[PDB]
Structure formats: C-alpha cells, structure tokens
Amino acid sequence: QISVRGLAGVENVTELKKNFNRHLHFTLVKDRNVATPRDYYFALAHTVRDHLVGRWIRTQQHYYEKDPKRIYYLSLEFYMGRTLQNTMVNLALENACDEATYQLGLDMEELEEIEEDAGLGNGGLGRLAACFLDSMATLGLAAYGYGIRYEFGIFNQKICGGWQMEEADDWLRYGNPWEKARPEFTLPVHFYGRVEHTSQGAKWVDTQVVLAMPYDTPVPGYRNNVVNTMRLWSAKAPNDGYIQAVLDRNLAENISRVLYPNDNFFEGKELRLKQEYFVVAATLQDIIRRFKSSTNFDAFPDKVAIQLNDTHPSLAIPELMRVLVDLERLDWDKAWEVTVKTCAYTNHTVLPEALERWPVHLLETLLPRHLQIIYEINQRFLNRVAAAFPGDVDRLRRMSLVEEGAVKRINMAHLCIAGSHAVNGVARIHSEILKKTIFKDFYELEPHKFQNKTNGITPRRWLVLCNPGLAEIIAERIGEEYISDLDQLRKLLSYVDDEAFIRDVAKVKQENKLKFAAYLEREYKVHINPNSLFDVQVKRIHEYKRQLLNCLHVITLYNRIKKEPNKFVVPRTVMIGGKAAPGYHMAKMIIKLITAIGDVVNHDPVVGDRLRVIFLENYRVSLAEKVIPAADLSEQISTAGTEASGTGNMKFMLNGALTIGTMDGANVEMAEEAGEENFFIFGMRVEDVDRLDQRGYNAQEYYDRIPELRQIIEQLSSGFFSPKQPDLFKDIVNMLMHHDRFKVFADYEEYVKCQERVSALYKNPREWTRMVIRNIATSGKFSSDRTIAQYAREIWGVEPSRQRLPA
Amino acid sequence: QISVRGLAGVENVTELKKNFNRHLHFTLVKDRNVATPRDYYFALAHTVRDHLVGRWIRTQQHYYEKDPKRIYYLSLEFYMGRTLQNTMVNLALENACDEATYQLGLDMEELEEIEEDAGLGNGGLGRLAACFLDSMATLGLAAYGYGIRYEFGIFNQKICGGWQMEEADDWLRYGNPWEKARPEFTLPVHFYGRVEHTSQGAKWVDTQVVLAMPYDTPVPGYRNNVVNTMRLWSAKAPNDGYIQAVLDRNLAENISRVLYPNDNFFEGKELRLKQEYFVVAATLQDIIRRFKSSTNFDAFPDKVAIQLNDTHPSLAIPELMRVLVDLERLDWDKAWEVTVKTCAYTNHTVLPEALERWPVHLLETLLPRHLQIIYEINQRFLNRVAAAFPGDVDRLRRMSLVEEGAVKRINMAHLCIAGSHAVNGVARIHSEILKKTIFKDFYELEPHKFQNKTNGITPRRWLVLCNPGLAEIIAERIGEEYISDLDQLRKLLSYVDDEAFIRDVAKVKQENKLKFAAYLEREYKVHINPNSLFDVQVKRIHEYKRQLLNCLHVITLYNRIKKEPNKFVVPRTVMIGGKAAPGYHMAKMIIKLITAIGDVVNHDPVVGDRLRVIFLENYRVSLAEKVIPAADLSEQISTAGTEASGTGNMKFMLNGALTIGTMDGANVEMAEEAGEENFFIFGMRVEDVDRLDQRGYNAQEYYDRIPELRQIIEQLSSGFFSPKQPDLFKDIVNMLMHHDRFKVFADYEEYVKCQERVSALYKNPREWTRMVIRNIATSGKFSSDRTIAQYAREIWGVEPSRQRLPA
C-alpha cells in the first residue's frame, strides 16, 4: 500500500492467513461465526509473534556462543505502549499482514485499537527505558531490560464533572500474548531477618522469602534479525488458621500488584522499598548465574554493565557487594572495585522532592545487612573525601550517604555516585546544572565520573509507526536509511524551497488533523474545528511544567476576543492532557480549572469555533501516537532549570510541529540544532531565575503592573469560572499570588507576546510549513540510537553495529 | 504395544511428532538443548489438546443446532485428577503418542508424572462429579459441569515427625494447558445491598459486585467424538487511598482462592456461603441466556435440568425464583412450578454434622432478597403440609425450612426437597435410610419424589487408564466393548476354571505390586516386601470410617506375633492413607497413631518383613490410580449406617482386590452382585447398631470381656507407642472408652476373626484368584455409565446414546 510498510509478498500473505486461521481455531477455540474483533486481534497477535521466535532463540543462543559484555538496564518502569504494530514494522510484515487481514475481510487498524497499552510507567523516565530497549536491539547490543511486571500499570484516568477519577489499569484481563512466563526460572528474594557474624563471614538469617517469577517479552531490532529480551519479575508466595494462611499469600504477592503513580516525587512507603529490593535482588542473581555459566570476578566488569535508571534500583550497589562479600567470599576491596566498575547511574531531575531518602529505621528493619554495608561504604567514601580535601568538614557532612536529623536517612543519590564509575544527566543544560549545584562536591572529587547523555526517542514508534504518511513523503526523496540513521534527515534542508515537498508536508499534517478530529468525535462526541491551529500541551500535570501558564494564556485569548469581538484572530483548538498523581491536590485542581475554562469558553456564542479548550482524557503512549502527529504547536513551557530534558518535545519536532518553549532541558539543544530563529523561545533563562531567587520572587509586583493579568486573577477569585462555587479556585490563586515556586507571573508577558508571533506565522501557511521543514530536517540528533551509541562507547565499553543476523 | 491402547498409525505418529516440535518451538519457545521434561510434558499436552478442538466446537455447535434438553451438573467440587492420559485414551491416541514420544527419545509415562492433579475436591462427592462428567459425555448427553476454579485445591499433605502438615496446592503454578479462559463471557454476581419494593416488583439494590470469569475445560466421551464442557468460575474485582483500593481488589478475588477442606462437615463461614452463591448466580445467568438464545418459560423445564450435588448449590432454588419473579416478571406460582420441575437434589450422608444450616442473620445481610424468597417458600410449603396432615403441628415444626433456637437457621436440605422434583440417595441402603429416618416426613408428603441412584465409577480412568494390564487380559477374551458396557464383565465367570486366565490375573496383580513397591522405594526410600498381602485402607480420615478399628487389628497382629514368634502368619504390608481436615483434632491424632504403630512395628527384629505398617502420604486421585491396582485386600469398615455409598470400594472391586467390609452403603450391593460368599462381610448390621443405641453403648463391657483388646488399650495408655510422651494418645483412649459414636469395640472381635479368614484364603493362591475373578466379573453394575443412564431416564427425562459424531 505505502512503501516504508514493506512487501505484501504472495506466499507471505498466504502463509499469514492460514496461520491466522490456525490460531483462531486451535489457540482461541473459535470459528468465524462467533469470533469477535478481539479474537481476531489475538489470532493476529499470535501469528505475528511466531515470526520472532526463530530470531529470538538464535539471538540469545548467539550471546551464549560469542560471550559479549552484557548490558543490564535496570528500571522500575518500562512504558512500552502497544506491541503489535511495532513488531510488524520491525520485522517488515506490516503490509503483508494488512493485505492478509484485508483478504480475510478484516481492517487491521481496527484490530490494533484492541490492544491494551503495557502502561508500566509514569512518563518520561519510563518511556526512555522503552525507547532505549528498542535502540539497543537495533544497534546490536546484548542488552536486557529488567523490571517488575505490575499487575496494574499507571491508572486509567476518567474525567467526571471535570475532575480526575482513577481506576485500576487492568491490562492483563484478556491475557498478554507478547510475554512468555518462565516459572521454571523462579528465584528467591529475602526480606527482614537479622545479621549473624560467624567466620566465615556475615550471614543474613531468619528472613521471610518472596519468590520472583520472570516473564520474558521479546524486543525486536529494526530489520536486523536481533531479538533481545525484556524480563519482568512477578511476585509469588513461597511453597511453604489454614484458610487465612492461604489468603495471606496475597501480602507477599502485593509486591508486584501496582505501579506507584508518582511522577518526579518521593513517597517513603515500605511497599515501594520492597518493590525496589525485589527487582534488584532477583535481577542480580540472574546476572551472576549467567556470568558463571560461560567464580573469579576480576573479569565481571568486562562482562557486565548494570545501568541504574534513577536511584530506584540503587540497592543494586549494596546488593552486589553483599553477594560478592558474604556469598562469594571476596575481600571487601576487590568487591568494591568490581561494583564501581560494573555500575553507572542516570539522574533525571534536580527537584529536591524527587530525591530518595529512606529512613534508616526502615532499612534497618527490612534490609539489615544492606544498611551495614551502606555504613561501611559511607565510611570508606568519606575517608576518601577527607584525604582529598583535608579539614573540610562541611564538605564531609554534605557528601555523606547519611543525613542527620529528627529522622536519620540514607541519601540514595549519594550512594549511586559513590558506587558508580559514571553518573550522567539527560541533556546538556541539566548535566551542567548538576555539576554547578547539587552534585558539585562530587564533581570536585571525581570529575571524570560526570557525563552528559542527551535523551532521544525512537524514530520507529515515534515516526514510522505513528506517522506513516510523513515517513512516506520523506522516504520518497531520501530512501529508507534515515529510519535507523536519523541524521540523514538533514538532507531535507535541500527541499526547503521545493514546492512539491512544501505541499506534501502541509497535506500530511492536514490528514493527521482530520483523522484526530474524527477520533475525538467518534470516541467522545466532541466537535473540533479542523482549520484551527492545534495547540497542544501533553505531559504529566505538575507545577514545574506550568500548565497554569497555558491556562493564563488561554483565558487571555478569550478576554481579548470579548473586548474586541470583530478583530480577526487565528482560530485555535487548545488541547491539554495528562495525569495527576492521586495525592497531589494542586495537580488535580489544575485539571479542574482547564475543564472549567472549557465550560465557559466552549459555550460562548461570540467565540464560537474561533477558540476551543479541551482536556484530553487518559493521556498514555497510544494516545500520544495519535495526537502528536496532528499537532501544530508544541507547548514546552517549563520554568528554566526544572525540566531535565523532556522527550515529548522531541516527538513533536519529529512529527511536524513547531515548538513554543523556554530555554530548558533539551529545548536548548533542539533550538541549537534547528537555529533559534526556527523556534518560539521565550521567558527567563536559568540565570534570570537565579537573579529573581536572589532578590525574592514577589508575584504581587506582576499583578500590579499587568492589567490583563489582574483581570484573569479577579475572574478566578470572584467565581467567573465556577459560578456555583465562587471560591472553588482560591487555592490556585493563593499559590500564584504567594507561594509560586515556578514563577508563573514572571514569564506571562513574554509568553503572551511570543504566542502572538506564533499566530502571525500561522497566517502565512507557506512560511509556517518551511519553518516546519527546517525543524524536521534537524531532529536527527534526538534519535535514541544516537543516545544509546553514546552510552555504549562512553559508559558501557561496547561497540554498536548495524549488521543483520541470519534470516 | 498393547491393543486396548489403540493404533500407532505411521501418519498419525509422524504428525504428532512434528506438532510436538512445533509447540516446543513456537508455544514454549525452547529448543531441544535447554528443554526440561516439564517442557516436553507441555509440548505433548498442547499437541494432544489440538486433537479435541475439532470435536469440541462441533459438539457445542451441534447442541445449538438440535436444541436438546441441557443437563447442568452443579457442584462445589470437581475432583478431576490428571487429564493427559485420560484424553489420549478417550481419543484413541495413547499408543500413537507413546510411539511418537519414543521416536523422539522420550518416555511418555515419565512425562505424565509431571502433570498436577486438578484436586478441586475433597473425596467421594467431588470424584463422583468427575466420573459423572466422563459418563455423560460417553452417553452422548448435552451436559455441562459448573463449578469454581479454586486457585488452590485440596491441600498437599506432608508428614513431619509422623504428623500431618498442610501446604498450599499451587496447581496452576506452571499453567493449565487444558482450560481455555473466556474473559469475554464474564458476568456480574451481587452481594449485600437491601431490598426495595416498587411496582413493578421487588428490587435488589446497593449491592457490591463481584465478576465471575469462566474457564472452559474439555470433557471427551469414550471414542464417540463427543466433547462436552466443564465450566469453572473465577472471581474478579469490578472494573470500578489509591494504592490500598487497588490492593483491596484481593478481598473480592478471595472468593475463588481456596477449596474448603472439610469432607462431610459443615462450617458456617461467610466466605463459604459466598462461594456457594457465586457459583449459583453465575451459572444460572449462563443457563438462562443459553435458553433464550434458541422469554416464555413454560418450556424451561423441558430444556433445562439442574442437578444439585448436595446442598452446596441449594441457593439455585431461590436464585431461579428471584430471576423469574423479579427480573422476568413471572407470577410466583408459575415461577415455582418451573423451579421445582427444573431442579433435583442428591444427598450424600445422613450424619447431622454435615447438614448445612445457615444463620438467618448471615443470609439476611449477605442475601436479603434470597432470605425473603426462602420465607415465602417455607410458608407455601408448610401450607401444603397442613392441608395434607391437618392438625399435625409437630410435623410442621420438624419440616420447616426454618429452625428455631438461640440462633434461627435455614435448613438447606429442607429447602432442596421443597424446591426439587426428585431427591435421591447414592446407594440402596442409604436411600431407604433417608425414607425411614431424616426425610421420613418429606417421604410421607411426596413419596414419588424419592429415588435411589447407586453410585458408580468410570471404567475408563478406573480400569483402562490405571490398570492397562488387567484391561488387556480381559480384552483378549471378550473384546473391548466392556469398556463402555461394563455389564459384559459377567462373561468372565465362564473363565473361573480357565487355567490361563487364573494365571494371567495373578500375574497382572503381581506386576502392579512390583511396580507400586518400586514407586515407594524410588520416591520415598521405604522398603516393602512384595510377597506380602497388600492390605489397604485409603479414604479421608474420619471416625465413621474407622481407621482406628484397622489400627486395633494391626496391633493385634503384632502382639500375636510377639506372643508366638514361631507360628507362621501370612505376611502383610498394611497401608493406610488419607487427609484429615486441618481443624479436626481427632483425625490428626489418628494419623499420628498410625505412624507411631509403624515406628514400633517396622523396627522390631522379631517381626522383620512379616508385618509392615505404612502411612501413604498425600492420598489424591493420581495416587489412587497407583495403589488401588496393587491391592490385595480392600478395607471398607465403616459403622453400619454411616457410609452413604462409598466409591473407593468399587475401584478396588474393579481392579482385583477382595473386600473386607460391613454391610454399609454400596458394599451391600457389591456383595449381592458377586454373592456374599465372595466377600469378607463382618460386624453389626444397621439393625444391630440401632439395638445397641436403644440399650446404650458401653465400651467398658467389651474391654472387660476381651483380653487382647484390653492389652492394646493398656499399651496405648501407658505409652508403648509413644515412649517419650506416654500420655500422647489419652484423647484417643478416652474417646474409645467413653464417647465412641461409631462403636469401634463392638465390631472388634468379628473383625479380627474375619481377618483370619482373609489370611486363610491368601494361603491358597489359586482359590484367592478364583474369588477375585468372581468379583471382577460382577463389578459391571458399578459403572458410572449405568448410574448416569438412570439419572437421565428417571430424573432428567433424556435418552442416552452410544452413536459417534462425524470424525
């Protein structure tokens, strides 16, 4: 049908069809008279998964045979999304399956909508894990993803009366055809107990046991026959009155029941700590077994890299030490050398509320041996700080793994830096901020530890998959190589005055917009004007991301229209979407304000279809693949210094939106790649935020000097956006006026003015589209292949590769 | 290899082999270098299940097409055992798979030992359900089994220090290849709430919802291409702080977590009541849907029979009424007519402690609408009793569904009789006892309600499967027809003086004994003498079954040997096995006494291999298939009047053991079938037990008059069988001396004397074996095909059939 989708070979189609029917009859036990589309999806899913197994067994067999260094990507979150399309695309079976399902009288796309997201993540950090597994398989690395198989992923969000309601994300209800259960490789994990010193060694005794049962999911590289593994652990009660004892097996099985729904926020809950130890202990036994199956650990860092995605599996460090010292009888010093050289740590935020700082009492109880090891680590590490900086005792107290206070805590970031050979941030500004501020003392001690690794996104899911029309028009001019060599998109600059390309680019955007508008009307009965500018902010709801600043802009547009009804303005559909953490009262109030603004704006007959505001419900990876290709303006308006990188930013750039943003995170590099003249950059830079902090931020000043701002705040206080409950938003108002950590009012004027520049350009379609070309053509750096190649060469010590395995 | 096992066709073998390899590669994702026997079992299991699906879909499709009356067998227990061998035998694929697995270098029998029992039952009543599904499919009935899919079946029993220890029967750990999940046919069940009377009707509102998810298992008939369904419901929380709310989904899912482990004993636990309503509500919605999918219910009893296996799903009666009256708007009278004609009830014991008698307060809370309906039922039913027996008010209070007392209760048996058109016992003596005693008032009101249906066992599992050697020697003389026409075994009487048959019968027994002895030594390192008489009592541990009486006999044999060491006695290996309910202190003490007797007996050098006592651990359906074909003497020694039927009795008769027993349950019919002269019948008859009850049972009398008995009791009291804990068995002694409901001492002398007759015969091998022939040849009545044909003609109103469906 379209070329980037591959060949619908005649044998291939004929084979797929009968394999479809075979699974429908034997696997599903259905005939065509009773089968639902759901059965059809599953038949197709089984059929497609059979095409991997040959490669899946050979890839793993090949790593047994050639013994390369193995990379273990350890994360509490893998935000995988759907798997069916992605698997077809990476195996080159998309047109063949589309034709085969067509010949059976089925619409493949309709079938794809049946698959549940594997929503085992919150947002950026979990999706990065997902993009990384893709890129590592595409670059031929012997890489494993290790995580938890949550029974319930990130909650499904409903909006009732304009408010978020959470419900269980029961993603496994109808089964998961992609995973293979491996109960035969189940492993014991220990909790509680107490420590005995004998000789030989310390001994961790009287523990409770939880079993960890692995489930393996395949991870296919792009057209290279590589199929790596994502292994996720599931919690199981041990083998060994009566009814209550059987029922009490749930307590241990609750360890993998549900993903904690906090994006960038630390809650010190014991269950969360258990989940972190559970993934770390099970994983490290796997790693060690595999290493032995090729008891002298000199070579262990040449054969193993363990990458820590945030501090969440930071326990890997004292766990590896525990195994090496207590079970393998290595001297401490050798063990530590091995540990540091095996581990590396990635930081994803500088915001203090995200820092993991576990109470010492809690670790003492749940993991007594690990606390002792942490103390010994801290002593030797601070001994090093003393030798390097004699007499600097404040530096000692600041660098310590132990925080003194009402409650003594362990700082997990400090543990990670001490126990890792490399520490990285996720965009250049962020990595520099780390060296200047929170990790400055650690930087001065060990400067060659500290690196940058700018994030990326996979151009498979985030272009070929979600926007096949754009991928096609690009392939038509430059071939298909850019798909795994995204720097080739720079060749599109030579088309910035090509009339046919300019036309094709606009036509593809317009098709994405028409299609997205159809989705909304079909699945939610909401009418959007398809000739409006699609203005979109999609990401988790937080104060630092400044959805409220968007809110102030939206209401400004409304009040401007009402003051001068007859003045032309570019129509917009302003879309905001994302989940709030269940406990974050402020976040929930903001979602409510967005829907409340909609209640006025969308029913004002003077405004009509010139301005609509909609809250996109249940933002998740599959909804991202729909709305991002339809977008005109990408809102990326975080307070300078707060967004470590962002990745949603990159998706929009890749898919033909222009960006309005602050110089924060990877926005800085994106503007550098495209030319600043091709970005709507506004607001304080980091330096200016600091100057404001030095002086004191006083919101009242901005209110007193900006009449349009004053009018919005008064509308909020007096009840204009909540007539029945006039004080409904007093908490938002008070925060804005007196406790705004993110300085919303200080960027208001520059933001509104920059938004005027956006509209001005949109009035000139031709020049809008030429600027878009200049963005797409410079998005190549933001491929996760680039990012992962940098991890492999600069941290892991492995060489990536583009060569096929046998067919 | 052997003929009854079927043809190893060359194409068939070639096809099985590649399907084996296909599943190993695609389903299991394994190659032959890493595969465990466990993987091989699963590959074989998937391969074998593919051979059913053609027939499975056509059978169900055929019942849609011909609309016969459907039979719904409703039970809280389906004691299915293993499925792999049974499926091969019923499809005629046993030799073909054996040859195919042989050609792959695999031992099929070894593979079969990997499969877990589906142990979703306690004992007799659950196995009967299992045998019935087999026989109904073999007789061509459109029959469904409806039950609960317990996550944990009957507990696995370990014996530590001679004591029972229970652990979770985690039967689903490695998956179940036989079932197909049907989450798409999930259904809501309601609990709690309260009743509103509007008009139209009563309304049950404010309920909590539990979802019921069906899993379908195939049930293949013997070589007739019929494949019926066993549907088992599994509990699921409804779709709709946050973490605790997700975790609290377990409370509702606990409904199907674990089988209650009480054999013949009522515990009034709310969770058990919930399980009973859950199976009944889900099942009845299925039934009604299916009936509508062919809203006038005149024909509903012509299209539906619901059979109640004990009172456990007795709620079916007020549930069917609730649906018909409240949801379908039928007048009460018509609804009741439909209900009585749809339902029938099977009783399995007369022991009062087994009677379900639920507190009115509990039903009021959990099932308010059902309590009201029960009250209305009771009123109209007692109105009938008054018209038939004017002025007999004691009869009214005795017959009432409501028991008055400190706690008001509902008598579920009384509900069943009132709401059913047929009530049956499970052996002729038992059915007569019901009419004479506990149900006498109900018999006088409605005599044509009351029937007998003598139990049976399936000759597939219980002969062809478990004892292929015996089945072969029988087939060699009479052909294979007896396999589904077990009355043909009477032709074996003409061989009672055939020298070759006498030899073959003894040779087969001897092979079963050698093999069982090998099992015990391999899997437990216990040495048994294979030229000893294998004396076996296997069944649940209860006082009424009188394992203690066996205990007294065993110790008598020991004391006799010690008193006269040089006198010849026939060597025996005395085997006792079975589970005690976790809470039944007495039952647990008895298991302990058996092992304690072993501790003395088996280490006395004067006894040596002349007498051994072993406690067979973890008696379950698969262990029954091993030990029953190896047995010489079948112990069936319950107090006359207490064992409603028994079915273990029948297994032993079928498999070439002779029986020592009381005239109780189906023992009476078995002796009638074979001739009493071919049974070791001893002890009080029912009549004699009654006379003893009239006079008062005084144990002391038997103790004072029987020196050998006195010596055993003194050995028990003084600590001979527990030197370290001399008073260990004082509770057993005291029960025997002062509270023995089952009158152990009263049958002691006759039992010991009858056991002397057994030994005397065993000394004459030829005449032992001729008596065995006379037993086997008269076991035909005890086929479950016979039983089910009687249910179909005399209760359900359907005609059984022996004809094939298309290939």
Ligand SMILES: O=c1c(O)c(-c2ccc(O)c(O)c2)oc2cc(O)cc(O)c12
């Ligand atoms: O807008 C979209 C839409 O509605 C569907 C869809 C949903 C349900 C169905 O049953 C169906 O056939 C298609 O898919 C999409 C896929 C995209 O990549 C982008 C989109 O904008 C849509």
Ligand SMILES: O=c1c(O)c(-c2ccc(O)c(O)c2)oc2cc(O)cc(O)c12
């Ligand atoms: O005694 C028996 C025995 O040991 C086995 C067995 C167990 C484990 C194995 O691995 C194996 O190959 C065979 O099966 C049996 C099957 C019967 O029907 C009867 C028996 O008496 C045995």
